């Protein structure tokens, strides 16, 4: 169902001097849920219950996000993709996941998840994805309604828009959920970014990392790598499509529909679809996991 209550309490692990937070409930092979920008593990709160009894349910908060520690010094060079991967790879190793991991990913969580699967293919039992960064794109592929704002985040205007005005959290997030959020839900997303300044840097560094029109070249190369691999991988996949959707539409959606060994369902939503159709999403992930883990 819908609801504002988190799925569980946060557990903490020390990673490279910083404490990272994650939800970890149940037992069995992992079903790893990874949020993107400007969210946290909270994004999956109404989806994880659907997998009760199917495995160890885990949802990690990326560095500087959710209840994971902020990095200091922080500035324009902090929280780039590579730095996030460095912290997340270490946390996932620390969690002792074994080799039958089912990844459930969204947004930057999909870029990080796809990248890790390419690099640990024998340990991935299945991949469920939605509103993902499935390949490098062009501005023409970006949702029309937010094109100017994302170009502004990528310009020097980004610091005022995000560090001072907190626009990713206050405008983009609610703007890409079809239903109105309650104060408790909005408070849960605002919490890590309440303080003006560098505390909000992760929500500004992330849009500056999207592989668009070949820039930044390093992330474009990384996405090109996992896109090519996923398109040829026999790993079971579940494509949770959205209507109207946002990022995984047009060319990117056509590309994803070519991936092999894939099941598809479509749910109502824009970008943060977990807030609009959690039960339909959770039920399909549960059906997928039951096929992968015949009891
Ligand atoms: Br972003
Ligand atoms: Br570049
Ligand atoms: Mg500490
Ligand atoms: Mg905090
Ligand atoms: Mg389009």
PDB file of C-alpha atoms and ligand atoms in Angstrom:
ATOM      1  CA  UNK A   1       0.000   0.000   0.000  1.00  0.00           C
ATOM      2  CA  UNK A   2       0.939   3.677   0.117  1.00  0.00           C
ATOM      3  CA  UNK A   3       2.199   5.042   3.439  1.00  0.00           C
ATOM      4  CA  UNK A   4       4.811   7.375   4.966  1.00  0.00           C
ATOM      5  CA  UNK A   5       6.467   4.955   7.399  1.00  0.00           C
ATOM      6  CA  UNK A   6      10.005   3.832   6.570  1.00  0.00           C
ATOM      7  CA  UNK A   7      10.469   0.104   5.907  1.00  0.00           C
ATOM      8  CA  UNK A   8      12.880  -0.405   8.787  1.00  0.00           C
ATOM      9  CA  UNK A   9      15.432   1.368  10.919  1.00  0.00           C
ATOM     10  CA  UNK A  10      18.824   2.302   9.509  1.00  0.00           C
ATOM     11  CA  UNK A  11      21.887   0.169  10.252  1.00  0.00           C
ATOM     12  CA  UNK A  12      25.362   1.707   9.832  1.00  0.00           C
ATOM     13  CA  UNK A  13      28.718   0.465   8.499  1.00  0.00           C
ATOM     14  CA  UNK A  14      32.017   2.381   8.488  1.00  0.00           C
ATOM     15  CA  UNK A  15      33.295   2.937   4.976  1.00  0.00           C
ATOM     16  CA  UNK A  16      36.524   4.834   4.387  1.00  0.00           C
ATOM     17  CA  UNK A  17      36.152   6.990   7.510  1.00  0.00           C
ATOM     18  CA  UNK A  18      32.479   7.754   6.956  1.00  0.00           C
ATOM     19  CA  UNK A  19      29.445   6.045   8.349  1.00  0.00           C
ATOM     20  CA  UNK A  20      27.031   4.778   5.667  1.00  0.00           C
ATOM     21  CA  UNK A  21      23.373   3.958   6.363  1.00  0.00           C
ATOM     22  CA  UNK A  22      21.199   1.131   4.992  1.00  0.00           C
ATOM     23  CA  UNK A  23      18.021  -0.797   5.616  1.00  0.00           C
ATOM     24  CA  UNK A  24      18.546  -4.571   6.002  1.00  0.00           C
ATOM     25  CA  UNK A  25      15.580  -6.848   6.804  1.00  0.00           C
ATOM     26  CA  UNK A  26      14.950 -10.582   6.532  1.00  0.00           C
ATOM     27  CA  UNK A  27      17.150 -13.476   5.521  1.00  0.00           C
ATOM     28  CA  UNK A  28      18.239 -15.244   2.367  1.00  0.00           C
ATOM     29  CA  UNK A  29      19.950 -14.201  -0.877  1.00  0.00           C
ATOM     30  CA  UNK A  30      19.851 -10.404  -1.282  1.00  0.00           C
ATOM     31  CA  UNK A  31      17.354  -8.244  -3.100  1.00  0.00           C
ATOM     32  CA  UNK A  32      19.211  -4.963  -3.256  1.00  0.00           C
ATOM     33  CA  UNK A  33      17.227  -1.779  -3.862  1.00  0.00           C
ATOM     34  CA  UNK A  34      19.222   1.320  -4.894  1.00  0.00           C
ATOM     35  CA  UNK A  35      17.859   4.871  -5.018  1.00  0.00           C
ATOM     36  CA  UNK A  36      19.251   7.784  -7.034  1.00  0.00           C
ATOM     37  CA  UNK A  37      19.012  11.619  -6.894  1.00  0.00           C
ATOM     38  CA  UNK A  38      17.769  13.386  -4.631  1.00  0.00           C
ATOM     39  CA  UNK A  39      16.251  10.413  -2.821  1.00  0.00           C
ATOM     40  CA  UNK A  40      17.385   7.741  -0.332  1.00  0.00           C
ATOM     41  CA  UNK A  41      16.373   4.200   0.764  1.00  0.00           C
ATOM     42  CA  UNK A  42      13.014   5.780   1.752  1.00  0.00           C
ATOM     43  CA  UNK A  43      12.038   5.659  -1.936  1.00  0.00           C
ATOM     44  CA  UNK A  44      11.513   1.871  -1.673  1.00  0.00           C
ATOM     45  CA  UNK A  45       9.535   1.755   1.565  1.00  0.00           C
ATOM     46  CA  UNK A  46       6.237   0.542   0.047  1.00  0.00           C
ATOM     47  CA  UNK A  47       7.838  -1.736  -2.523  1.00  0.00           C
ATOM     48  CA  UNK A  48      10.099  -3.823  -0.267  1.00  0.00           C
ATOM     49  CA  UNK A  49       7.188  -5.303   1.798  1.00  0.00           C
ATOM     50  CA  UNK A  50       6.091  -7.175  -1.357  1.00  0.00           C
ATOM     51  CA  UNK A  51       9.280  -9.257  -1.176  1.00  0.00           C
ATOM     52  CA  UNK A  52       8.788 -10.319   2.436  1.00  0.00           C
ATOM     53  CA  UNK A  53      10.101 -13.880   2.873  1.00  0.00           C
ATOM     54  CA  UNK A  54      11.825 -13.944  -0.523  1.00  0.00           C
ATOM     55  CA  UNK A  55      15.266 -12.811   0.644  1.00  0.00           C
ATOM     56  CA  UNK A  56      17.434 -10.414   2.601  1.00  0.00           C
ATOM     57  CA  UNK A  57      15.871  -6.988   1.745  1.00  0.00           C
ATOM     58  CA  UNK A  58      18.500  -4.258   1.594  1.00  0.00           C
ATOM     59  CA  UNK A  59      18.358  -0.556   0.641  1.00  0.00           C
ATOM     60  CA  UNK A  60      21.540   1.564   1.029  1.00  0.00           C
ATOM     61  CA  UNK A  61      21.741   5.384   1.262  1.00  0.00           C
ATOM     62  CA  UNK A  62      24.469   6.805  -1.068  1.00  0.00           C
ATOM     63  CA  UNK A  63      27.300   8.819   0.521  1.00  0.00           C
ATOM     64  CA  UNK A  64      26.189  12.316   1.558  1.00  0.00           C
ATOM     65  CA  UNK A  65      22.553  11.265   1.111  1.00  0.00           C
ATOM     66  CA  UNK A  66      19.860   9.788   3.382  1.00  0.00           C
ATOM     67  CA  UNK A  67      21.522   9.117   6.725  1.00  0.00           C
ATOM     68  CA  UNK A  68      25.009   8.442   5.270  1.00  0.00           C
ATOM     69  CA  UNK A  69      27.682  10.982   6.338  1.00  0.00           C
ATOM     70  CA  UNK A  70      28.530  14.142   4.370  1.00  0.00           C
ATOM     71  CA  UNK A  71      32.039  14.444   2.883  1.00  0.00           C
ATOM     72  CA  UNK A  72      34.211  17.413   4.020  1.00  0.00           C
ATOM     73  CA  UNK A  73      35.869  19.169   2.258  1.00  0.00           C
ATOM     74  CA  UNK A  74      32.988  19.531  -0.197  1.00  0.00           C
ATOM     75  CA  UNK A  75      32.800  21.706  -3.287  1.00  0.00           C
ATOM     76  CA  UNK A  76      32.350  21.546  -7.097  1.00  0.00           C
ATOM     77  CA  UNK A  77      34.726  18.563  -7.311  1.00  0.00           C
ATOM     78  CA  UNK A  78      32.975  16.434  -4.693  1.00  0.00           C
ATOM     79  CA  UNK A  79      30.336  13.717  -5.096  1.00  0.00           C
ATOM     80  CA  UNK A  80      31.066  12.896  -8.717  1.00  0.00           C
ATOM     81  CA  UNK A  81      30.027   9.469 -10.021  1.00  0.00           C
ATOM     82  CA  UNK A  82      33.389   7.831  -9.426  1.00  0.00           C
ATOM     83  CA  UNK A  83      33.455   8.934  -5.790  1.00  0.00           C
ATOM     84  CA  UNK A  84      29.965   7.550  -5.194  1.00  0.00           C
ATOM     85  CA  UNK A  85      30.997   4.237  -6.795  1.00  0.00           C
ATOM     86  CA  UNK A  86      34.047   4.060  -4.601  1.00  0.00           C
ATOM     87  CA  UNK A  87      31.925   4.341  -1.465  1.00  0.00           C
ATOM     88  CA  UNK A  88      29.091   2.053  -2.723  1.00  0.00           C
ATOM     89  CA  UNK A  89      31.385  -0.716  -4.011  1.00  0.00           C
ATOM     90  CA  UNK A  90      33.012  -0.831  -0.550  1.00  0.00           C
ATOM     91  CA  UNK A  91      29.632  -0.869   1.262  1.00  0.00           C
ATOM     92  CA  UNK A  92      28.307  -3.679  -1.000  1.00  0.00           C
ATOM     93  CA  UNK A  93      31.452  -5.715  -0.368  1.00  0.00           C
ATOM     94  CA  UNK A  94      31.064  -5.027   3.402  1.00  0.00           C
ATOM     95  CA  UNK A  95      27.478  -6.409   3.313  1.00  0.00           C
ATOM     96  CA  UNK A  96      28.590  -9.982   2.332  1.00  0.00           C
ATOM     97  CA  UNK A  97      26.056 -10.364  -0.457  1.00  0.00           C
ATOM     98  CA  UNK A  98      27.164 -13.685  -1.930  1.00  0.00           C
ATOM     99  CA  UNK A  99      26.527 -14.554  -5.587  1.00  0.00           C
ATOM    100  CA  UNK A 100      22.739 -14.591  -6.189  1.00  0.00           C
ATOM    101  CA  UNK A 101      21.965 -10.876  -5.899  1.00  0.00           C
ATOM    102  CA  UNK A 102      18.786  -9.465  -7.381  1.00  0.00           C
ATOM    103  CA  UNK A 103      19.301  -5.745  -8.104  1.00  0.00           C
ATOM    104  CA  UNK A 104      16.307  -3.364  -8.071  1.00  0.00           C
ATOM    105  CA  UNK A 105      17.427   0.043  -9.369  1.00  0.00           C
ATOM    106  CA  UNK A 106      16.317   3.563 -10.271  1.00  0.00           C
ATOM    107  CA  UNK A 107      17.992   6.763 -11.682  1.00  0.00           C
ATOM    108  CA  UNK A 108      21.622   7.088 -10.522  1.00  0.00           C
ATOM    109  CA  UNK A 109      21.050   3.875  -8.570  1.00  0.00           C
ATOM    110  CA  UNK A 110      20.638   2.182 -11.969  1.00  0.00           C
ATOM    111  CA  UNK A 111      23.873   3.690 -13.361  1.00  0.00           C
ATOM    112  CA  UNK A 112      25.720   2.475 -10.238  1.00  0.00           C
ATOM    113  CA  UNK A 113      23.900  -0.883 -10.255  1.00  0.00           C
ATOM    114  CA  UNK A 114      24.396  -1.608 -13.986  1.00  0.00           C
ATOM    115  CA  UNK A 115      28.091  -0.640 -13.655  1.00  0.00           C
ATOM    116  CA  UNK A 116      28.558  -2.978 -10.654  1.00  0.00           C
ATOM    117  CA  UNK A 117      26.713  -5.866 -12.431  1.00  0.00           C
ATOM    118  CA  UNK A 118      28.881  -5.500 -15.533  1.00  0.00           C
ATOM    119  CA  UNK A 119      31.829  -5.920 -13.160  1.00  0.00           C
ATOM    120  CA  UNK A 120      30.397  -8.743 -11.060  1.00  0.00           C
ATOM    121  CA  UNK A 121      28.226 -10.583 -13.603  1.00  0.00           C
ATOM    122  CA  UNK A 122      28.385 -14.045 -12.022  1.00  0.00           C
ATOM    123  CA  UNK A 123      26.986 -12.650  -8.778  1.00  0.00           C
ATOM    124  CA  UNK A 124      23.840 -11.183 -10.346  1.00  0.00           C
ATOM    125  CA  UNK A 125      20.736 -13.420 -10.389  1.00  0.00           C
ATOM    126  CA  UNK A 126      18.365 -10.870 -11.910  1.00  0.00           C
ATOM    127  CA  UNK A 127      17.995  -7.136 -12.561  1.00  0.00           C
ATOM    128  CA  UNK A 128      14.776  -5.143 -12.044  1.00  0.00           C
ATOM    129  CA  UNK A 129      15.052  -1.538 -13.304  1.00  0.00           C
ATOM    130  CA  UNK A 130      12.869   1.495 -13.867  1.00  0.00           C
ATOM    131  CA  UNK A 131      13.442   5.135 -14.943  1.00  0.00           C
ATOM    132  CA  UNK A 132      17.073   4.345 -15.452  1.00  0.00           C
ATOM    133  CA  UNK A 133      20.089   5.921 -17.144  1.00  0.00           C
ATOM    134  CA  UNK A 134      20.366   2.974 -19.506  1.00  0.00           C
ATOM    135  CA  UNK A 135      22.792   4.555 -21.996  1.00  0.00           C
ATOM    136  CA  UNK A 136      24.403   7.919 -22.814  1.00  0.00           C
ATOM    137  CA  UNK A 137      21.848  10.342 -24.271  1.00  0.00           C
ATOM    138  CA  UNK A 138      21.459  13.640 -26.158  1.00  0.00           C
ATOM    139  CA  UNK A 139      19.541  16.684 -24.978  1.00  0.00           C
ATOM    140  CA  UNK A 140      16.944  15.667 -27.591  1.00  0.00           C
ATOM    141  CA  UNK A 141      16.356  12.517 -25.490  1.00  0.00           C
ATOM    142  CA  UNK A 142      15.855  14.463 -22.265  1.00  0.00           C
ATOM    143  CA  UNK A 143      12.306  15.173 -21.073  1.00  0.00           C
ATOM    144  CA  UNK A 144      11.269  18.459 -22.651  1.00  0.00           C
ATOM    145  CA  UNK A 145       9.742  19.910 -19.488  1.00  0.00           C
ATOM    146  CA  UNK A 146      12.984  19.920 -17.494  1.00  0.00           C
ATOM    147  CA  UNK A 147      15.579  20.481 -20.162  1.00  0.00           C
ATOM    148  CA  UNK A 148      16.270  24.151 -19.379  1.00  0.00           C
ATOM    149  CA  UNK A 149      16.443  23.557 -15.648  1.00  0.00           C
ATOM    150  CA  UNK A 150      18.904  20.677 -16.012  1.00  0.00           C
ATOM    151  CA  UNK A 151      21.069  22.767 -18.361  1.00  0.00           C
ATOM    152  CA  UNK A 152      21.036  25.447 -15.626  1.00  0.00           C
ATOM    153  CA  UNK A 153      22.076  22.926 -12.910  1.00  0.00           C
ATOM    154  CA  UNK A 154      24.986  22.053 -15.222  1.00  0.00           C
ATOM    155  CA  UNK A 155      25.977  25.763 -15.580  1.00  0.00           C
ATOM    156  CA  UNK A 156      27.416  28.028 -12.853  1.00  0.00           C
ATOM    157  CA  UNK A 157      23.832  28.860 -11.914  1.00  0.00           C
ATOM    158  CA  UNK A 158      23.701  25.454 -10.248  1.00  0.00           C
ATOM    159  CA  UNK A 159      25.193  26.608  -6.985  1.00  0.00           C
ATOM    160  CA  UNK A 160      22.483  29.193  -6.336  1.00  0.00           C
ATOM    161  CA  UNK A 161      19.666  26.956  -7.574  1.00  0.00           C
ATOM    162  CA  UNK A 162      20.683  23.968  -5.452  1.00  0.00           C
ATOM    163  CA  UNK A 163      23.010  24.984  -2.629  1.00  0.00           C
ATOM    164  CA  UNK A 164      20.963  28.109  -1.814  1.00  0.00           C
ATOM    165  CA  UNK A 165      17.447  27.426  -3.154  1.00  0.00           C
ATOM    166  CA  UNK A 166      17.427  23.576  -2.885  1.00  0.00           C
ATOM    167  CA  UNK A 167      15.537  23.278  -6.152  1.00  0.00           C
ATOM    168  CA  UNK A 168      16.196  19.595  -6.847  1.00  0.00           C
ATOM    169  CA  UNK A 169      14.590  18.567  -3.578  1.00  0.00           C
ATOM    170  CA  UNK A 170      11.851  21.253  -3.548  1.00  0.00           C
ATOM    171  CA  UNK A 171      10.900  21.399  -7.218  1.00  0.00           C
ATOM    172  CA  UNK A 172      12.174  18.488  -9.388  1.00  0.00           C
ATOM    173  CA  UNK A 173      11.229  15.740  -6.932  1.00  0.00           C
ATOM    174  CA  UNK A 174       7.559  16.704  -6.307  1.00  0.00           C
ATOM    175  CA  UNK A 175       7.352  17.813  -9.929  1.00  0.00           C
ATOM    176  CA  UNK A 176       8.020  14.253 -11.098  1.00  0.00           C
ATOM    177  CA  UNK A 177       5.576  12.409  -8.854  1.00  0.00           C
ATOM    178  CA  UNK A 178       1.986  12.393 -10.094  1.00  0.00           C
ATOM    179  CA  UNK A 179       0.289  12.479  -6.699  1.00  0.00           C
ATOM    180  CA  UNK A 180       0.786  15.181  -4.061  1.00  0.00           C
ATOM    181  CA  UNK A 181       3.115  14.086  -1.266  1.00  0.00           C
ATOM    182  CA  UNK A 182       2.196  14.406   2.414  1.00  0.00           C
ATOM    183  CA  UNK A 183       4.279  16.576   4.734  1.00  0.00           C
ATOM    184  CA  UNK A 184       5.819  13.416   6.313  1.00  0.00           C
ATOM    185  CA  UNK A 185       6.907  12.067   2.910  1.00  0.00           C
ATOM    186  CA  UNK A 186       8.319  15.443   1.834  1.00  0.00           C
ATOM    187  CA  UNK A 187       9.993  15.839   5.193  1.00  0.00           C
ATOM    188  CA  UNK A 188      11.691  12.436   4.708  1.00  0.00           C
ATOM    189  CA  UNK A 189      13.170  13.580   1.393  1.00  0.00           C
ATOM    190  CA  UNK A 190      14.135  17.074   2.664  1.00  0.00           C
ATOM    191  CA  UNK A 191      15.796  15.793   5.820  1.00  0.00           C
ATOM    192  CA  UNK A 192      19.353  15.125   4.503  1.00  0.00           C
ATOM    193  CA  UNK A 193      19.314  18.450   2.661  1.00  0.00           C
ATOM    194  CA  UNK A 194      17.774  20.810   5.191  1.00  0.00           C
ATOM    195  CA  UNK A 195      21.042  22.835   5.581  1.00  0.00           C
ATOM    196  CA  UNK A 196      21.921  25.491   3.005  1.00  0.00           C
ATOM    197  CA  UNK A 197      25.321  25.084   1.386  1.00  0.00           C
ATOM    198  CA  UNK A 198      27.548  22.032   0.870  1.00  0.00           C
ATOM    199  CA  UNK A 199      25.118  19.651   2.630  1.00  0.00           C
ATOM    200  CA  UNK A 200      23.120  19.866  -0.649  1.00  0.00           C
ATOM    201  CA  UNK A 201      26.123  19.327  -2.932  1.00  0.00           C
ATOM    202  CA  UNK A 202      25.161  15.724  -3.814  1.00  0.00           C
ATOM    203  CA  UNK A 203      21.882  16.906  -5.457  1.00  0.00           C
ATOM    204  CA  UNK A 204      23.874  19.375  -7.620  1.00  0.00           C
ATOM    205  CA  UNK A 205      26.811  17.141  -8.439  1.00  0.00           C
ATOM    206  CA  UNK A 206      24.461  14.415  -9.679  1.00  0.00           C
ATOM    207  CA  UNK A 207      22.822  16.321 -12.543  1.00  0.00           C
ATOM    208  CA  UNK A 208      26.309  17.486 -13.567  1.00  0.00           C
ATOM    209  CA  UNK A 209      27.168  13.797 -14.063  1.00  0.00           C
ATOM    210  CA  UNK A 210      24.337  12.754 -16.444  1.00  0.00           C
ATOM    211  CA  UNK A 211      25.926  11.518 -19.664  1.00  0.00           C
ATOM    212  CA  UNK A 212      24.455  14.009 -22.142  1.00  0.00           C
ATOM    213  CA  UNK A 213      25.860  15.131 -25.481  1.00  0.00           C
ATOM    214  CA  UNK A 214      29.118  13.393 -24.590  1.00  0.00           C
ATOM    215  CA  UNK A 215      29.767  15.346 -21.346  1.00  0.00           C
ATOM    216  CA  UNK A 216      31.136  14.577 -18.788  1.00  0.00           C
ATOM    217  CA  UNK A 217      33.211  12.210 -20.933  1.00  0.00           C
ATOM    218  CA  UNK A 218      34.141   9.915 -18.074  1.00  0.00           C
ATOM    219  CA  UNK A 219      30.527   8.994 -17.123  1.00  0.00           C
ATOM    220  CA  UNK A 220      29.581   8.749 -20.846  1.00  0.00           C
ATOM    221  CA  UNK A 221      32.306   6.068 -21.213  1.00  0.00           C
ATOM    222  CA  UNK A 222      31.050   4.187 -18.152  1.00  0.00           C
ATOM    223  CA  UNK A 223      27.397   4.163 -19.394  1.00  0.00           C
ATOM    224  CA  UNK A 224      28.466   3.184 -22.893  1.00  0.00           C
ATOM    225  CA  UNK A 225      30.201   0.134 -21.298  1.00  0.00           C
ATOM    226  CA  UNK A 226      27.266  -1.124 -19.258  1.00  0.00           C
ATOM    227  CA  UNK A 227      24.765  -0.356 -22.029  1.00  0.00           C
ATOM    228  CA  UNK A 228      26.686  -2.559 -24.481  1.00  0.00           C
ATOM    229  CA  UNK A 229      26.955  -5.340 -21.921  1.00  0.00           C
ATOM    230  CA  UNK A 230      23.297  -5.339 -20.774  1.00  0.00           C
ATOM    231  CA  UNK A 231      22.129  -5.523 -24.365  1.00  0.00           C
ATOM    232  CA  UNK A 232      23.918  -8.875 -24.717  1.00  0.00           C
ATOM    233  CA  UNK A 233      23.527 -10.328 -21.217  1.00  0.00           C
ATOM    234  CA  UNK A 234      21.465 -13.510 -20.587  1.00  0.00           C
ATOM    235  CA  UNK A 235      20.784 -12.377 -17.022  1.00  0.00           C
ATOM    236  CA  UNK A 236      17.016 -12.354 -16.280  1.00  0.00           C
ATOM    237  CA  UNK A 237      15.642  -8.812 -16.352  1.00  0.00           C
ATOM    238  CA  UNK A 238      12.416  -7.092 -15.300  1.00  0.00           C
ATOM    239  CA  UNK A 239      11.753  -3.766 -17.044  1.00  0.00           C
ATOM    240  CA  UNK A 240       9.284  -1.764 -14.994  1.00  0.00           C
ATOM    241  CA  UNK A 241       8.154   0.702 -17.632  1.00  0.00           C
ATOM    242  CA  UNK A 242       6.252   3.890 -16.801  1.00  0.00           C
ATOM    243  CA  UNK A 243       3.565   6.043 -18.416  1.00  0.00           C
ATOM    244  CA  UNK A 244       4.063   8.822 -19.041  1.00  0.00           C
ATOM    245  CA  UNK A 245       7.517   8.052 -17.701  1.00  0.00           C
ATOM    246  CA  UNK A 246      10.313  10.617 -18.021  1.00  0.00           C
ATOM    247  CA  UNK A 247      13.842   9.423 -18.599  1.00  0.00           C
ATOM    248  CA  UNK A 248      13.103   5.905 -19.893  1.00  0.00           C
ATOM    249  CA  UNK A 249      11.006   6.882 -22.858  1.00  0.00           C
ATOM    250  CA  UNK A 250      11.680   7.438 -26.538  1.00  0.00           C
ATOM    251  CA  UNK A 251      15.059   6.158 -27.752  1.00  0.00           C
ATOM    252  CA  UNK A 252      16.149   4.876 -24.364  1.00  0.00           C
ATOM    253  CA  UNK A 253      12.937   2.862 -23.946  1.00  0.00           C
ATOM    254  CA  UNK A 254      13.282   1.337 -27.438  1.00  0.00           C
ATOM    255  CA  UNK A 255      16.884   0.342 -26.559  1.00  0.00           C
ATOM    256  CA  UNK A 256      15.803  -1.306 -23.247  1.00  0.00           C
ATOM    257  CA  UNK A 257      13.081  -3.238 -25.090  1.00  0.00           C
ATOM    258  CA  UNK A 258      15.831  -4.961 -27.051  1.00  0.00           C
ATOM    259  CA  UNK A 259      17.499  -6.399 -23.941  1.00  0.00           C
ATOM    260  CA  UNK A 260      17.393 -10.199 -23.755  1.00  0.00           C
ATOM    261  CA  UNK A 261      15.564 -12.501 -21.268  1.00  0.00           C
ATOM    262  CA  UNK A 262      13.339  -9.679 -20.131  1.00  0.00           C
ATOM    263  CA  UNK A 263       9.851  -9.387 -18.682  1.00  0.00           C
ATOM    264  CA  UNK A 264       8.049  -6.069 -18.857  1.00  0.00           C
ATOM    265  CA  UNK A 265       5.182  -4.398 -17.022  1.00  0.00           C
ATOM    266  CA  UNK A 266       4.032  -0.787 -17.263  1.00  0.00           C
ATOM    267  CA  UNK A 267       2.892   1.275 -14.313  1.00  0.00           C
ATOM    268  CA  UNK A 268       1.627   4.839 -13.972  1.00  0.00           C
ATOM    269  CA  UNK A 269       4.296   7.429 -13.071  1.00  0.00           C
ATOM    270  CA  UNK A 270       6.702  10.135 -14.322  1.00  0.00           C
ATOM    271  CA  UNK A 271      10.198   9.750 -12.835  1.00  0.00           C
ATOM    272  CA  UNK A 272       9.841   8.857  -9.156  1.00  0.00           C
ATOM    273  CA  UNK A 273       7.332   6.135  -9.965  1.00  0.00           C
ATOM    274  CA  UNK A 274       7.751   4.361  -6.662  1.00  0.00           C
ATOM    275  CA  UNK A 275       5.595   7.118  -5.155  1.00  0.00           C
ATOM    276  CA  UNK A 276       2.709   6.549  -7.577  1.00  0.00           C
ATOM    277  CA  UNK A 277       2.481   2.791  -8.177  1.00  0.00           C
ATOM    278  CA  UNK A 278       4.357   1.015  -5.325  1.00  0.00           C
ATOM    279  CA  UNK A 279       2.085  -2.038  -5.113  1.00  0.00           C
ATOM    280  CA  UNK A 280       2.108  -2.793  -8.818  1.00  0.00           C
ATOM    281  CA  UNK A 281       5.910  -2.380  -8.838  1.00  0.00           C
ATOM    282  CA  UNK A 282       6.405  -4.510  -5.748  1.00  0.00           C
ATOM    283  CA  UNK A 283       4.084  -7.263  -6.960  1.00  0.00           C
ATOM    284  CA  UNK A 284       5.942  -7.599 -10.232  1.00  0.00           C
ATOM    285  CA  UNK A 285       9.352  -7.682  -8.481  1.00  0.00           C
ATOM    286  CA  UNK A 286       7.980 -10.386  -6.140  1.00  0.00           C
ATOM    287  CA  UNK A 287       6.666 -12.469  -9.074  1.00  0.00           C
ATOM    288  CA  UNK A 288      10.061 -12.082 -10.782  1.00  0.00           C
ATOM    289  CA  UNK A 289      11.978 -13.181  -7.690  1.00  0.00           C
ATOM    290  CA  UNK A 290       9.675 -16.200  -7.183  1.00  0.00           C
ATOM    291  CA  UNK A 291      10.486 -17.359 -10.726  1.00  0.00           C
ATOM    292  CA  UNK A 292      14.214 -16.912 -10.069  1.00  0.00           C
ATOM    293  CA  UNK A 293      14.037 -18.673  -6.679  1.00  0.00           C
ATOM    294  CA  UNK A 294      11.524 -21.583  -7.187  1.00  0.00           C
ATOM    295  CA  UNK A 295      10.387 -22.731  -3.722  1.00  0.00           C
TER     296      UNK A 295
HETATM  297 BR1  LIG B   1      20.247  13.913 -11.558  1.00  0.00          BR
HETATM  298 BR1  LIG B   2      34.046  16.320 -20.141  1.00  0.00          BR
HETATM  299 MG1  LIG B   3      32.228   8.923  12.257  1.00  0.00          MG
HETATM  300 MG1  LIG B   4      21.882  13.468   8.650  1.00  0.00          MG
HETATM  301 MG1  LIG B   5      11.513  12.135 -25.338  1.00  0.00          MG
END
